[PDB]
Design a binder for this molecule. Sequence first.
Ligand SMILES: C[S@@+](CC[C@H](N)C(=O)[O-])C[C@H]1O[C@@H](n2cnc3c(N)ncnc32)[C@H](O)[C@@H]1O
Ligand SMILES: C[S@@+](CC[C@H](N)C(=O)[O-])C[C@H]1O[C@@H](n2cnc3c(N)ncnc32)[C@H](O)[C@@H]1O
Lengths: 239, 243
Amino acid sequence: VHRLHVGDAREVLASFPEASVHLVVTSPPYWTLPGQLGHIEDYEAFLDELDRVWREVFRLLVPGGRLVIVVGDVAVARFGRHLVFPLHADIQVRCRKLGFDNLNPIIWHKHTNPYEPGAIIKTEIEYILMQRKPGGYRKPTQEQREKSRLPKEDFHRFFRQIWDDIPPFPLELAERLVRMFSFVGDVVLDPFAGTGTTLIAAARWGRRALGVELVPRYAQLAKERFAREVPGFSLEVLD
Amino acid sequence: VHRLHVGDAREVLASFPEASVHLVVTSPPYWTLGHIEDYEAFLDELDRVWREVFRLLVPGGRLVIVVGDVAVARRRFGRHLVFPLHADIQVRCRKLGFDNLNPIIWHKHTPYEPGAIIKTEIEYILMQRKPGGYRKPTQEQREKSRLPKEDFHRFFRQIWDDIPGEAPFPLELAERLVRMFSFVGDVVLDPFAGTGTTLIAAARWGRRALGVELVPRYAQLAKERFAREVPGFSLEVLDGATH
Ligand SMILES: C[S@@+](CC[C@H](N)C(=O)[O-])C[C@H]1O[C@@H](n2cnc3c(N)ncnc32)[C@H](O)[C@@H]1O
Ligand SMILES: C[S@@+](CC[C@H](N)C(=O)[O-])C[C@H]1O[C@@H](n2cnc3c(N)ncnc32)[C@H](O)[C@@H]1O
């Protein structure tokens, strides 16, 4: 049963049983801002709220489970002084505190492209962070393994540090992560469901979708979007 | 005058006057391994160097750090993992006052079931700018530092995949950074000079070279390599001798 719960991710995840989730693929909610350190204070207050969700994720994740976070660093130019908040970096260092093992991230190259020194380089990438729960991975059955095997060409395209062939993140981006880090039958959660990209990706490949979304309006849009992308199946929404 | 001081980055940099450096390009020393402590402690050591850099840097100048995350998989415990060195350095530089800028990704290295490990292909080129106002170069500095259109668009992009790996970094990557973030005549600093790639890169492009290197044997290799790759000029190595 593909589920999507409406409510605060921190509260909802709190009502789920430990080690019942195999994979988390998600994108942290949008964060936007006279003023000295007032900005970084709100910034670190944001991180404090994300940490609460990551902490719950570390609980409901099975050992060997993984938390995948797709994040771009928040830039702010004309304090008109150009400044970039290193979100991906902060999230990485903070997850170590929650007990996650950090793995190499995959660089999502989203945007491909007075000539004097000092020019600002435009943002072209988002980071796909990988945080693993240690302890000793579970073992999928022979059938699960066989049905989750990736064709050679897809394997070599997916498992590389930089993805430059995928211009809310795209379904194809989510389908890759679901296929790379879970097996058919596994539960794939997204604490910040949005329009349900991850749920659609998970459901589409024989995994069980489990999501949480704050705004009830978006929850409904996802169910409809879900019913279109997942022919025959439906997205159960509750509060 | 291009100089290389043989000594400890923390102590040696402490003696230089504030706001006397325009650009710092460097690669922190090799990190080798409870273990998080050895790690957090190494980070603490590095911070003592960044602190001096922030003071030594003129407003608007920057600290460029090329680091690859240290993967020590299947080693200690019974699992693979990676120390996010680049991420830890980025967070810690903010606490020191630096303005974080977007990093450049150096694409160094260009079953079939779920869970496979992805091998390291990249290194990070961290950019930490010291706030304090824009920069102020002469007209001749602008005319002589101005980059041709083709080069500008080849350098000012977030991913570099045209510079093959293998001295944590090539002369081409250093020379590229020097042309992008300093002006002819400025002072370029590398507190961890090693064989002096940064020093050489600065000199070949009309910038004043400055550096620190703990190992005299490396500094000497630096002096000789410099002289080899910097015709007409020599690298002055200062032990600090007297008498
Ligand atoms: C980056 S978006 C998710 C996008 C995903 N790629 C998709 O296609 O849906 C983050 C979501 O978190 C929601 N949000 C913000 N604060 C929340 C909270 N405390 N609990 C749950 N959702 C929250 C926002 O409404 C938003 O839809
Ligand atoms: C990654 S290497 C720099 C290599 C450089 N890219 C080159 O072309 O040789 C770091 C350097 O820092 C030096 N080092 C380590 N600890 C130091 C310290 N406390 N003070 C000064 N140098 C130190 C090491 O001897 C080493 O050569």
